[PDB]
Design a protein around this nucleic acid. Structure first.
Ligand SMILES: [Mg+2]
Ligand SMILES: [Mg+2]
Ligand SMILES: [Mg+2]
Ligand SMILES: [Mg+2]
Ligand SMILES: [Mg+2]
Ligand SMILES: [Mg+2]
Ligand SMILES: [Mg+2]
Ligand SMILES: [Mg+2]
Ligand SMILES: [Mg+2]
Ligand SMILES: [Mg+2]
Ligand SMILES: [Mg+2]
Ligand SMILES: [Mg+2]
Ligand SMILES: [Mg+2]
Ligand SMILES: [Mg+2]
Ligand SMILES: [Mg+2]
Ligand SMILES: [Mg+2]
Ligand SMILES: [Mg+2]
Ligand SMILES: [Mg+2]
Ligand SMILES: [Mg+2]
Ligand SMILES: [Mg+2]
Ligand SMILES: [Mg+2]
Ligand SMILES: [Mg+2]
Ligand SMILES: [Mg+2]
Ligand SMILES: [Mg+2]
Ligand SMILES: [Mg+2]
Ligand SMILES: [Mg+2]
Ligand SMILES: [Mg+2]
Ligand SMILES: [Mg+2]
Ligand SMILES: [Mg+2]
Ligand SMILES: [Mg+2]
Ligand SMILES: [Mg+2]
Ligand SMILES: [Mg+2]
Ligand SMILES: [Mg+2]
Ligand SMILES: [Mg+2]
Ligand SMILES: [Mg+2]
Ligand SMILES: [Mg+2]
Ligand SMILES: [Mg+2]
Ligand SMILES: [Mg+2]
Ligand SMILES: [Mg+2]
Ligand SMILES: [Mg+2]
Ligand SMILES: [Mg+2]
Ligand SMILES: [Mg+2]
Ligand SMILES: [Mg+2]
Ligand SMILES: [Mg+2]
Ligand SMILES: [Mg+2]
Ligand SMILES: [Mg+2]
Ligand SMILES: [Mg+2]
Ligand SMILES: [Mg+2]
Ligand SMILES: [Mg+2]
Ligand SMILES: [Mg+2]
Ligand SMILES: [Mg+2]
Ligand SMILES: [Mg+2]
Ligand SMILES: [Mg+2]
Ligand SMILES: [Mg+2]
Ligand SMILES: [Mg+2]
Ligand SMILES: [Mg+2]
Ligand SMILES: [Mg+2]
Ligand SMILES: [Mg+2]
Ligand SMILES: [Mg+2]
Ligand SMILES: [Mg+2]
Ligand SMILES: [Mg+2]
Ligand SMILES: [Mg+2]
Ligand SMILES: [Mg+2]
Ligand SMILES: [Mg+2]
Ligand SMILES: [Mg+2]
Ligand SMILES: [Mg+2]
Ligand SMILES: [Mg+2]
Ligand SMILES: [Mg+2]
Ligand SMILES: [Mg+2]
Ligand SMILES: [Mg+2]
Ligand SMILES: [Mg+2]
Ligand SMILES: [Mg+2]
Ligand SMILES: [Mg+2]
Ligand SMILES: [Mg+2]
Ligand SMILES: [Mg+2]
Ligand SMILES: [Mg+2]
Ligand SMILES: [Mg+2]
Ligand SMILES: [Mg+2]
Ligand SMILES: [Mg+2]
Ligand SMILES: [Mg+2]
Ligand SMILES: [Mg+2]
Ligand SMILES: [Mg+2]
Ligand SMILES: [Mg+2]
Ligand SMILES: [Mg+2]
Ligand SMILES: [Mg+2]
Ligand SMILES: [Mg+2]
Ligand SMILES: [Mg+2]
Ligand SMILES: [Mg+2]
Ligand SMILES: [Mg+2]
Ligand SMILES: [Mg+2]
Ligand SMILES: [Mg+2]
Ligand SMILES: [Mg+2]
Ligand SMILES: [Mg+2]
Ligand SMILES: [Mg+2]
Ligand SMILES: [Mg+2]
Ligand SMILES: [Mg+2]
Ligand SMILES: [Mg+2]
Ligand SMILES: [Mg+2]
Ligand SMILES: [Mg+2]
Ligand SMILES: [Mg+2]
Ligand SMILES: [Mg+2]
Ligand SMILES: [Mg+2]
Ligand SMILES: [Mg+2]
Ligand SMILES: [Mg+2]
Ligand SMILES: [Mg+2]
Ligand SMILES: [Mg+2]
Ligand SMILES: [Mg+2]
Ligand SMILES: [Mg+2]
Ligand SMILES: [Mg+2]
Ligand SMILES: [Mg+2]
Ligand SMILES: [Mg+2]
Ligand SMILES: [Mg+2]
Ligand SMILES: [Mg+2]
Ligand SMILES: [Mg+2]
Ligand SMILES: [Mg+2]
Ligand SMILES: [Mg+2]
Lengths: 76, 59, 188, 136, 98
RNA sequence: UAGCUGGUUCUCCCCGAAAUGACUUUAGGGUCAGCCUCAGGCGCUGACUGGGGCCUGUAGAGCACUGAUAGGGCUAGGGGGCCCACCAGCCUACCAAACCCUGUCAAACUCCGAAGGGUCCCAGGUGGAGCCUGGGAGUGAGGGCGCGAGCGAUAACGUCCGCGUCCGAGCGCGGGAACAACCGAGACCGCCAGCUAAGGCCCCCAAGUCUGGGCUAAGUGGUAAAGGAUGUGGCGCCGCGAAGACAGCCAGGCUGGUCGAGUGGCGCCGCGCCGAAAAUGA
RNA sequence: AGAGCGCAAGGGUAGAAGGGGGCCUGACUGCGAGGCCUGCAAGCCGAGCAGGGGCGAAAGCCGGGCCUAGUGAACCGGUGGU
RNA sequence: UCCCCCGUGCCCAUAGCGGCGUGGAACCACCCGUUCCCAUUCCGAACACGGAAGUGAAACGCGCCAGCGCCGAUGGUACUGGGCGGGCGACCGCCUGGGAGAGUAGGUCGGUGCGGGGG
């Protein structure tokens, strides 16, 4: 035939979860598109990679129309 | 958290790894072995998952 | 029709059926109660009763409720009723599938045709007092290739079609013997 | 038909969605056992049906084969089967309604459906009609 | 339309919602993440005369006095569906000129 | 030279694997990781479990999207019958786009969605648990069975992955007639002690020719299908019937007489009969 | 939102990543807290710092293209520089 | 504190689509004009500036209606962690804990912060 083909797995998805302590810069979640939006103290890079901008705890916030956001609540 | 007498009666030979680990947590060595433990929510959950192996007693 | 109902509470839904009782529940804009009729009784009752005529349920509370089966859960794997809904009426108008007696010898069956019949019953807004055993359908002038729609129904007084004013009701299709078998076997 | 080449085998689990209720016609035919029903099996039944009662009423076929039936040419293991040999099949689970007649007598139907049974692989039953629908 | 508004929202604190009427020109210092206005120097519906542009300059100076009193200084302006050029221009124009 | 085959000698004691992944002129060979072990560190951190939060697109179901689809309606286009080129008009048990209804299907469809799993926090958990550094390895053909898919023919003691397991290494013990992996069970040594486990308690063969309540006349049991049949027992319904029914006997072509208590058709459950032919003796 | 997003498919997206103009060349140098992934090597995301600069009134964005392919250890040798 | 407005953030269709009614004192819009700042690949439709008078028609604000849309129990299933039984097999069944989708009843023309103008 002519089929046996596939690009190796990219291992994306939720990397960090809500209620997890995070350093500054830890990739919070790798993703295909905008399956998750940025938020409080959370930036993103060319591949739509979400990552902490501060130290603290992750939190997820669903907002229907707006979409799903993820932020880190600072504290020390 | 009254006492819980638990006696092992069905050999774990053949049951899943997790199950054997449960008996280890409760501290069950050999067959027909006695063991009285508190009735904490945690200790329950284990004794529950091995219920088909042991006979529980409310002491 | 009458039917001896009972109150349910904790009885095992499945273990119940094995006994001989059919699970069910009555309810309306204000009511909600676990019940359970009898299989054999409900059977012969609901056979004719179906879901066009009303049935008062006699609870041990002596209460005579004017209910009708809003829905029945038929069990897959060899048909048989699993569970039964019971909508309790009052005086406010209520929608429901009313029967339909198609009466007449359509031109279709004359030239050798087929008794097509879409909606063997029709949902219609209506007061609880109005309990039309059925509705006359003037099917007779219907020839092969023709059909009859909702916008052409004979509505009794105090009733309205709670459907689409264009829905079909019945039709007249052809046979299908030799002419199709020989022709289809080659033309395919 | 139309869609694309080959499909998984899949297993026939519970008789769930496979099964319904006489939705057209007067009498019906219901499956007791699961199976893949071939295109030739349907045609075999349909024709045996009408041919029984000449110039008959109307026959409804509610099931429909869309699963490509794969099959290899009597060799070994290179790639997937060419398939298509038996053509296609319909995932028929117990309780399903294959055929149902209309505009005809009870004897004609009771015989015709009985006949179109032997044409099928599965052990089947004939249902009348009752009144089991969904209303009030 | 309000692309600009969203941009500044994520920027930081102390937004400056400049909503202007066909004859009026209000201005609020709204801090997001709580939704509370601070210095709300209205225009025509406040006290000022009648000359949109020159009125805008002064109302800006109005915010300034009320703002520097509360210890504010983040010039987080809010273009608010408006082209920075005229009325709105003077707002922050005077507001930042003092 | 031999990445191949064969051979490798005393005892006791503790622990105890793997047949996987990645690359490999690699595929019966290696190197790193994984799993075993030993020494020195650390010390409640471990498997498993309780509560909590977050993540997820399966089973199921569904038709909102991508597509499939049987019938019907409504309806553009095309084919044909009337008419004539003043091109349009009328019909149309012909094929049918879009739309609606009824009814369905889909690994590569999903408006929706379990159980469950993954992870972090707090807690129980002292275990041949756990983590850090280092010494020594072997292993890198795996196989049955259960479950979930592919391939195959919904074949194979088939094949290829996933979770689990046992054999491997427990061809040590009990059962299963016999029999790695099915059921029971994890064998330090001794005993002419006792309770059990699966499985059994008529004889070979240890223990009930034990008790009570039904069914089965085929040795069914002692292990085969579509389909066929007044087998037998038990349950429910429909048609006729003391205003005389079914059956037979008299007469006419349903009706009468006689006798005199039930009779005919359908559906469901239990056990059973047929379908049932192979080669050394059952 | 069934279009568009150069190209396969997918996730994503009009509260722009899409269509159109104005100015411009951050398809910069020197670095890199901390992570994803992972046997090794490799691949990936990146706040922020200093230099000098672009667009915007400004808060601010810019270390190439909506993102996931468009590629090749080491050796040997070529050309230009300190 | 109460009521109507104007600016704005939260909840994310029970906020919406469509139908009828209402508000111009204030506020907002439409509106008058195109000389100045500024602008449309063409137009003062849009951005923009200066402003009588007129209007609430359009737009927005506030109400009411449910026909579409949306939300949507309860009961009972399907499915299924864990446990187990029957049959020769394709498969079927029970115990224990969890439990949908669809469908029925039914709900719905919004709750709500903070500042500001007005009686
Ligand atoms: Mg592959
Ligand atoms: Mg992949
Ligand atoms: Mg960047
Ligand atoms: Mg980019
Ligand atoms: Mg075992
Ligand atoms: Mg676990
Ligand atoms: Mg009637
Ligand atoms: Mg006609
Ligand atoms: Mg017609
Ligand atoms: Mg008509
Ligand atoms: Mg194609
Ligand atoms: Mg192809
Ligand atoms: Mg296929
Ligand atoms: Mg059915
Ligand atoms: Mg060969
Ligand atoms: Mg058959
Ligand atoms: Mg707020
Ligand atoms: Mg050992
Ligand atoms: Mg590689
Ligand atoms: Mg190898
Ligand atoms: Mg080979
Ligand atoms: Mg070799
Ligand atoms: Mg190693
Ligand atoms: Mg831990
Ligand atoms: Mg832990
Ligand atoms: Mg937990
Ligand atoms: Mg939380
Ligand atoms: Mg699963
Ligand atoms: Mg699926
Ligand atoms: Mg499915
Ligand atoms: Mg559709
Ligand atoms: Mg047709
Ligand atoms: Mg048609
Ligand atoms: Mg139409
Ligand atoms: Mg024509
Ligand atoms: Mg002709
Ligand atoms: Mg002419
Ligand atoms: Mg013509
Ligand atoms: Mg004709
Ligand atoms: Mg036709
Ligand atoms: Mg439907
Ligand atoms: Mg739902
Ligand atoms: Mg969930
Ligand atoms: Mg769970
Ligand atoms: Mg969950
Ligand atoms: Mg967990
Ligand atoms: Mg200890
Ligand atoms: Mg060990
Ligand atoms: Mg160990
Ligand atoms: Mg080590
Ligand atoms: Mg080591
Ligand atoms: Mg293997
Ligand atoms: Mg295995
Ligand atoms: Mg087959
Ligand atoms: Mg298969
Ligand atoms: Mg086969
Ligand atoms: Mg292999
Ligand atoms: Mg082992
Ligand atoms: Mg072992
Ligand atoms: Mg042996
Ligand atoms: Mg053995
Ligand atoms: Mg062995
Ligand atoms: Mg063994
Ligand atoms: Mg057993
Ligand atoms: Mg072991
Ligand atoms: Mg005993
Ligand atoms: Mg016995
Ligand atoms: Mg006896
Ligand atoms: Mg047999
Ligand atoms: Mg049989
Ligand atoms: Mg015969
Ligand atoms: Mg025969
Ligand atoms: Mg007998
Ligand atoms: Mg029988
Ligand atoms: Mg007689
Ligand atoms: Mg014989
Ligand atoms: Mg798109
Ligand atoms: Mg861009
Ligand atoms: Mg465009
Ligand atoms: Mg362009
Ligand atoms: Mg440009
Ligand atoms: Mg680093
Ligand atoms: Mg690395
Ligand atoms: Mg790249
Ligand atoms: Mg300089
Ligand atoms: Mg960039
Ligand atoms: Mg690119
Ligand atoms: Mg761009
Ligand atoms: Mg990617
Ligand atoms: Mg070399
Ligand atoms: Mg007032
Ligand atoms: Mg008025
Ligand atoms: Mg004018
Ligand atoms: Mg001009
Ligand atoms: Mg001029
Ligand atoms: Mg233009
Ligand atoms: Mg103008
Ligand atoms: Mg008006
Ligand atoms: Mg209005
Ligand atoms: Mg409504
Ligand atoms: Mg809905
Ligand atoms: Mg919602
Ligand atoms: Mg619901
Ligand atoms: Mg429920
Ligand atoms: Mg668990
Ligand atoms: Mg299980
Ligand atoms: Mg439960
Ligand atoms: Mg739910
Ligand atoms: Mg629901
Ligand atoms: Mg729905
Ligand atoms: Mg309300
Ligand atoms: Mg409210
Ligand atoms: Mg508000
Ligand atoms: Mg308030
Ligand atoms: Mg007053
Ligand atoms: Mg007043």
């Amino acid at each position: 035939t002519k089929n046996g083909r596939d690009s190796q797995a990219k291992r994306l998805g939720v990397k960090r979860y809500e209620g997890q302590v995070v350093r500054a810069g830890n990739i919070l979640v790798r993703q295909r598109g905008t399956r998750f939006k940025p938020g409080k103290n959370v930036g993103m890079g060319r591949d739509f990679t979400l990552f902490a901008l501060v130290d603290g705890v992750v939190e997820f916030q669903d907002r229907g129309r707006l979409g799903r956001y993820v932020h880190v609540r600072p504290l020390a | 958290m009254p006492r819980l007498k638990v006696k092992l009666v069905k050999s774990p030979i053949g049951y899943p790894k997790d199950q054997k680990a449960a008996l280890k947590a409760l501290g069950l060595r050999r067959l027909q072995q006695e063991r009285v433990l508190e009735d904490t929510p945690a200790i329950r959950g284990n004794v529950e998952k091995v219920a088909h192996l042991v006979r529980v007693e409310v002491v | 029709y009458r039917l001896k109902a009972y109150y349910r509470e904790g009885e095992k839904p499945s273990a119940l059926r094995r006994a001989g009782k059919l699970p069910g529940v009555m309810y309306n804009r204000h009511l909600n109660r676990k019940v359970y009729v009898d299989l054999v009784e409900f059977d012969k009752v609901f056979r004719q009763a179906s879901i066009h005529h009303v049935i008062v349920l006699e609870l041990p509370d002596g209460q005579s409720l004017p209910t009708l089966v809003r829905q029945v859960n038929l069990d897959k794997r060899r048909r048989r009723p699993e569970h039964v809904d019971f909508f309790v009426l009052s005086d406010e108008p209520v929608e429901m599938y009313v029967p339909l007696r198609f009466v007449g010898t359509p031109a279709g069956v004359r030239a050798g045709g087929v008794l097509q019949e879409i909606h063997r019953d029709i949902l219609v807004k209506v007061s609880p007092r109005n309990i039309p055993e059925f509705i006359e359908v003037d099917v007779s002038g219907l020839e092969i290739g023709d059909s009859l729609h909702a916008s052409d129904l004979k509505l009794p007084p105090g009733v309205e079609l709670a459907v689409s004013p264009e829905e079909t009701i019945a039709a007249v299709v052809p046979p299908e013997d030799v002419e199709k078998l020989a022709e289809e076997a080659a033309a395919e | 038909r139309m869609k694309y080449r080959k499909q998984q085998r899949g297993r026939l689990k519970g008789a769930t969605k496979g099964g319904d209720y006489v939705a057209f016609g007067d009498f019906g035919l219901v499956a007791l056992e699961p199976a893949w029903i071939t295109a030739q099996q349907i045609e075999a039944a349909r024709v045996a049906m009408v041919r029984h009662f000449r110039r008959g009423g109307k026959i409804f076929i509610r099931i429909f084969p869309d699963k490509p039936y794969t099959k290899k040419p009597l060799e070994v293991r290179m790639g997937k089967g060419k398939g298509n040999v038996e053509g296609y099949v319909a995932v028929v689970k117990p309780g399903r309604v294959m055929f149902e007649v209309a505009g005809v007598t009870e004897e004609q139907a009771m015989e015709a459906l009985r006949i179109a049974g032997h044409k099928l692989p599965i052990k089947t039953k004939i249902v009348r009609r009752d009144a089991y629908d969904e209303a009030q | 339309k309000f692309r600009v508004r969203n941009r500044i929202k994520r920027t930081g604190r102390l937004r400056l919602s400049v909503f202007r009427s066909l004859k009026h020109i209000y201005a609020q210092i709204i801090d997001d993440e709580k939704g509370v206005t601070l210095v709300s120097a209205s225009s025509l519906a406040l006290k000022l005369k009648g000359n949109k542009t020159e009125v805008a300059r002064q109302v800006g100076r109005a915010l300034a006095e009320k703002a520097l009193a509360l210890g504010i200084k983040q010039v987080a302006f809010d273009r608010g569906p408006y082209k920075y050029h005229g009325r709105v221009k003077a707002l922050a124009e005077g507001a930042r000129e003092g």
